[PDB]
Design a protein around this ligand. Structure first.
Ligand SMILES: CCOC(=O)CCCCCC(=O)O
Ligand SMILES: CCOC(=O)CCCCCC(=O)O
Ligand SMILES: CCOC(=O)CCCCCC(=O)O
Lengths: 530, 530, 530
């Protein structure tokens, strides 16, 4: 590469070595296992670069990582991209067949796998034809990564290359038959860091990620760059605490002892943290958590607010950087009571800097932003995956019409507040209207003998596709379909046919189809019940 | 241009239309003349684009502006670059010959000139062969810019083009025989906005530019993008107050009435504001001002701190975006008293995000950062001018060795605090050492009968070039050279020959050479006295 | 495409329309279902081209076929490539997961699937995101392919394009974790047809494929172009009989009634044909069959020769066209008795025209052709796949050293007769020698109480990897390991340690691991027993 030093390239090495702030004595904390300074972090990054060069990793190679949230993962976020290699973050919660597919598809040269994921590897190791070295990561002194690092020097001259060099890749399991590979360049990751820092750093009072914060991720680092927060935290020079495997008591103790002020987690993790007995005697004031993985329930947001937590929701996916929207409250909105601002904080949010977002119909016609008209969110941003790796048709569908299709149906307020109703594929189309399949679950979850409600769509002759629904009975509650039909009729404020009670045909089923993640597989339900 | 919508281009139109925050009812205030909303600002930008297209301005054209800090200037910052034209900001404080040279060199198609600068134009209008239209700007209803805008629609589809398209240009008068043209692309300006917002937005407590601030520039908008603050303020959606011609009482009244919280000015303007009688009864709490044009005197910083002003210094030049360094205080540093933190706030500062800065010698060898060793600052940043317009040799010298040469001699602390001593060309070289020419002025300004001290260098046989110095007498003070020599001998803590008093040969001169800006011309002094 | 009519392109349309011979009244026979002439075949090809164009198939598209050996498959061999689309031949004997993987990997636009493979599709249809149309093939009048053809005209102007346009693709399941996609261009298929016709057409007496032959495939058409024989048979204008699903009695009746003279089959099919009661009263004189799928057993060859069948072996794989070697007998070799020429006819064969074949070691050093030294066959030919589709590392290994690696270990006679011992991956390496794992099975299959013998390799300390072996007991035969060890000791003519009986450790196991194809999975045995 001819650098042309006046021609600046946006590289992750500039995030590491040209940060907003750098304190060499600032700590990088890995739970209760390890604790070193930012100077040591910088040295270990150089040592890892040396070790990767010694292992034969060249520019364009793929180094896969199977690890928890650790200092090693943070070092992989930097050293692997900075030497010109693509960092492949393996979703360890995927099935071993899916993990093997992603490894074969990405053609990883070396896999950095934690010793606890070795049972996963043993099922698929024989069918891996592309990995020349396995580095086993451990939290003790026997870690092979640590041994590889300590035999190398802390000096490395990181190359300059094109900013459009692919730095990271990972696979998404969406609505395809196989996981879809999304990838991001150095420029895209640098721009994501800068844009999100400009968006949430410049907050007046609420929801700030600033240089005095203490960062602890509670979303996996094999997900979408952990929502880009490790890069932003490194560029801000803040204290970074990595918890390893997510144990709610361990996370609570880390928050208390390390004084964690900024985190990101999914609603399930936040609920587990808030419901833990250890959290009752915990001072959660000063802890800010953004909820982006799934929709943030208003009740969970209200409970977190009652615990004095600055809780707000964000939006993104594997294809989008991820961050496209974050909930940002005006000073007038922070004067509202807990119930009123729990609605605001649980919203999808407003589009972040440099992101243009529209809601369109099936013909890519932009719909008005009035808070009622709903359509698919389509986005343009500096950190979107241009396509799917080794894919043409799914890639063409993803960028149909000149915009990235998120697959989410939403309405946008006049003020710009996005609110997602449900997915495009999980849409109920009746005659000439589309109704969400998610609010029906909340409507039918209000009974005293309902546990889990799942809504699916199947065709009917006169009314087209109509929604079916699934519930489970309680103890000594042998209520038939008639009782649940009457309960659905007992609600109010419903449109179309009377009160949306003419073809509910609710059915009770003992077994509810759940995926390994924790969300119901709607396509599996469609295949099973039809 | 083939947009390739997945290939995101960093454009100023994305700063306007994809901001961090947008409040359509947020106000853009032009002193006491005009006041409209951000929606009206957006419409006027589209109207200006329509008017420029009607005038024949195409992509690659140059629209020059001769104006004060106004809403019109803010609209020129956006509409002219966004249609693909280069915005030429004319330094109205330059001599008419210099302004004419810059107009001829840039080959401006249309000049937007305020009616108060018409006397300047009348001296050079006949020698302008490249301008096809003059638009006269007025603060009344007779403004030609306003008339051109109101005859156009508020609808415009701004083009997509390459992000390396040149957006802005202006001319610097440094150490060359003619003004030097520096230029910046859309990508560079967008990156400057994002980087400075990430740097100062993410401040914990002190020196924040956030979404709740109220912005009023007090540095000219024909300077280096007004230090990029209009772009950042627009991207943050904050209330923007533009004062027009800088009158200290008008500025103070605007700060009081509009509740200005963020500003940028030079030390002279800050001194004029602090010394004005109207400022005594003014509550300056909540007003943050960054001082970047010249070195911030510690006494002025101390007085501003006594007025409860969050005053801090920044560093930059026409070639560098401008911002390279900003003073950022740790929470421990904010606990110091006024005198201790006046030293910190008056420092050059720490390099901002994405900026790598080094101090080198004449052979481009990097010097240690120890706070004592001094060398020329050399920088790499995403917003540096690649060269000088229509210049080769000065451009080669500017980027010699692969780094941009700032022309400033400085030392850098271990913590990264840069402190500039003086200029490279204004350097005193004796035998084997370099001594600053600026601290000598402060040393010799301590007498009771000295008004202005200027230090210049001229060769001597045994000791090489040695420093001469110039002072003026006071009323009924006919002190000869012997008294001032004794006063210089009366100091302490000086190195080299005894106490740096063997060849001072201080001379009194009635006339002190001052340029139009207000700084002494050292080359003019060299020519006059030798 | 600019044809440049003087610049001849080798296209499959030239195989169809510029053949060696064309009889418009020559018959294309599909078992007992359908029977039409070559003129009707030509018309149906044009009709299929019209139907594919109407369906939206463009140049570069992929049309997948899931069918038996039929006239429809023959028409797919021509019409799909000739319009510029890639014909994807789906191995219907693969597991539904593997078939789904290949469909997703090839990104097929339309699948032509026989109604009997619909149960396979129903398991994987939901996970196919790339197929826009399914055409169901039937042997009755309700076939959707027939209906699509009869609504189109028999006129089509087939395009001229580059001869390096990919015409066919299919997936190989070898020693990789996923099926490997090999592809071939129009030029490669035309050259394969010409080369094999020049090789076996120019035979003096034995093993001829000439213009008077009657062709019936007994190898699947989803395999390697059915060994290219449909193309050669069409180019020769000979009567082509397609049997559909392989039923031995149906195949025998077709051979008798249609007077089939040339066929190709695997040893299993030949054994089923020879052992069928219906074949005893069958005149097999004039029937020539080439055996290429697996090694031809000498006993099966001897039995076929006793049935007066011109039986000879060929060699090839999915990557190689397939044909690389065919057994060709000199007139002196045809004077030998049945036993002597059964050895010759069951050999791998001599390399066909335009094929250069070498045996090399692990360092790609060519070994002498002496009939004893064994190494991996490496080939260069005009019809080799250049790489694997969407694969880099496996593709690099396949063409390592500048030659295609077949994965087969063989020795070559001085006369050029290749004889394959076993596979490269199925190699037993002891100290400094390599011994085949296939002749040991025949050695240990000579007992009166052994059914199936499989030899696998596992490490030992002193002697390196050593061979283990697996057998099953017979009725009222409770022989222990000692008896089988004594039987192995009872043989003769063995090298190394005494008589290759010191660490046999033969073990009996009730369950023998067999894949769906019929061959033992050696890697599965390695995983299970270790
Ligand atoms: C503002 C932060 O919130 C986000 O970016 C949400 C990203 C979720 C991506 C999908 C997943 O990992 O499940
Ligand atoms: C951090 C803000 O301070 C600056 O960027 C200083 C820029 C001064 C440029 C030279 C001039 O206009 O006189
Ligand atoms: C001369 C004809 O013999 C061949 O070409 C053998 C080809 C076998 C390919 C592998 C398979 O399909 O199992």
């Amino acid at each position: 590469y001819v650098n042309d030093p006046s021609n600046y390239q946006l590289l992750i090495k500039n995030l590491l070595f040209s940060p907003v702030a750098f304190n060499p004595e600032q700590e990088i904390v890995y739970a209760n296992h390890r604790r070193h300074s930012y100077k040591t972090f910088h040295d270990r990054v150089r040592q890892f670069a040396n070790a990767l060069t010694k292992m034969g990793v060249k520019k364009g190679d793929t180094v896969a990582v199977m690890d928890y949230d650790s200092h090693r993962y943070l070092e992989c976020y930097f050293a692997i991209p900075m030497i010109g290699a693509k960092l492949h973050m393996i979703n360890v919660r995927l099935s071993p067949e899916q993990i093997l597919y992603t490894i074969d598809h990405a053609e990883d040269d070396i896999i950095l796998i934690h010793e606890e994921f070795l049972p996963i590897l043993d099922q698929i190791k024989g069918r891996i034809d592309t990995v020349t070295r396995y580095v086993v990561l451990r939290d003790d002194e026997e870690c092979e990564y640590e041994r590889l690092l300590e035999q190398e020097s802390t000096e490395y001259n990181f190359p300059d290359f094109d900013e459009n060099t692919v730095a990271t890749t990972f696979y998404t399991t969406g609505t395809t038959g196989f996981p879809k590979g999304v990838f991001f360049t150095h420029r895209q990751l640098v721009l994501h860091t800068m844009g999100i820092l400009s968006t949430i750093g410049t907050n007046a009072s609420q929801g700030r990620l600033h240089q005095g914060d203490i960062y602890m991720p509670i979303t996996p680092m094999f997900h979408v760059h952990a929502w880009g927060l490790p890069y932003m935290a490194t560029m801000l020079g803040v204290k970074q605490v990595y918890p390893g495997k997510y144990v709610p008591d361990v996370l609570l103790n880390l928050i208390e002892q390390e004084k964690v002020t900024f985190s990101h987690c999914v609603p399930t993790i936040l609920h587990l943290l808030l419901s833990s007995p250890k959290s009752k005697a915990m001072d959660f004031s000063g802890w800010k958590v953004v909820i982006g993985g799934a929709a943030l329930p208003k009740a969970l947001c209200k409970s977190a607010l009652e615990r004095d937590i600055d809780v707000f929701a964000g939006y993104g996916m594997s294809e989008t950087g991820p961050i496209l929207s974050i909930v940002q409250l005006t000073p007038e909105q922070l004067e509202l009571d807990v119930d009123q601002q729990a609605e605001y904080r649980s919203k999808t949010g407003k589009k972040v800097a440099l992101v243009e977002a529209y809601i369109v119909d099936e013909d890519m016609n932009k719909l008005p932003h009035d808070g009622e008209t709903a359509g698919e969110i389509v986005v343009r941003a500096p950190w979107l995956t241009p396509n799917y790796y080794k894919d043409n048709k799914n890639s063409k569908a993803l960028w149909r019409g000149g915009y990235l299709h998120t697959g989410d149906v939403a309405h946008i307020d006049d003020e710009g507040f996005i609110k997602i109703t449900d997915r495009v594929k999980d849409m109920i189309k009746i005659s000439g209207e589309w109704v969400s399949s998610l609010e029906l679950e909340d409507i039918l979850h209000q009974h005293q003998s309902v546990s889990e409600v799942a809504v699916i769509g199947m065709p009917h002759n006169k009314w087209g596709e109509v929604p079916l629904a699934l519930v489970t009975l309680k103890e000594d509650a042998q209520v038939t379909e008639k009782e649940l039909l009457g309960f659905a009729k007992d609600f109010i404020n419903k449109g179309i046919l009377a009160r949306e009670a003419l073809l509910l045909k609710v059915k009770i089923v003992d077994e509810i189809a759940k995926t390994s993640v924790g969300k119901v597989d709607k396509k599996e339900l469609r295949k099973l019940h039809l």
